């Protein structure tokens, strides 16, 4: 999002034997101005303070 809402989706197929979407929603700080993806479950995002990073791996 802009105001800082992140959403995440993954395939679970757990506990029932059928594919179920495991969703998150994080609330990372600051009005995000830009972001991009890094190899190995990493995300570079930017706030008007700093460029911060998030490791999903």
């Amino acid at each position: 999002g802009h105001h800082g809402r992140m959403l995440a989706i993954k395939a679970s197929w757990d506990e029932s034997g059928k594919l179920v979407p495991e969703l998150r929603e994080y609330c990372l700080p600051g009005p995000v101005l830009c972001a991009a993806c890094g190899g190995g479950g990493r995300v570079y995002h930017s706030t008007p303070s700093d460029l911060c990073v998030v490791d999903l791996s």
Binding site: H3, G4, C27, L28, P29
Partner: protein, 73 residues
């Protein structure tokens, strides 16, 4: 004022008096007023946890404001 170290943060460079030498940009002073400071962990530890605490507390604040405007609706 500029980033001469190339660390990702601006720094201030101060040139001290010309009475020292008749030579340019000698007697420098680079500083960030944080960590970076050039010239010519008991306390450093718990700051990152404190900064994350501030940011998280701010996010919780914005969350509550949202919850409040929802309830008013």
């Amino acid at each position: 004022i500029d980033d001469f170290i190339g660390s990702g943060t601006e720094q201030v460079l101060l040139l001290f008096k010309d009475s020292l030498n008749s030579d340019c940009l000698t007697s420098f002073k680079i500083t960030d007023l944080g960590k970076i400071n050039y010239s010519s962990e008991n306390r450093y530890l718990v700051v990152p946890p404190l900064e994350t605490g501030l940011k998280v507390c701010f996010s919780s604040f914005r969350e509550l404001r949202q919850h409040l405007l929802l309830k008013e609706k």
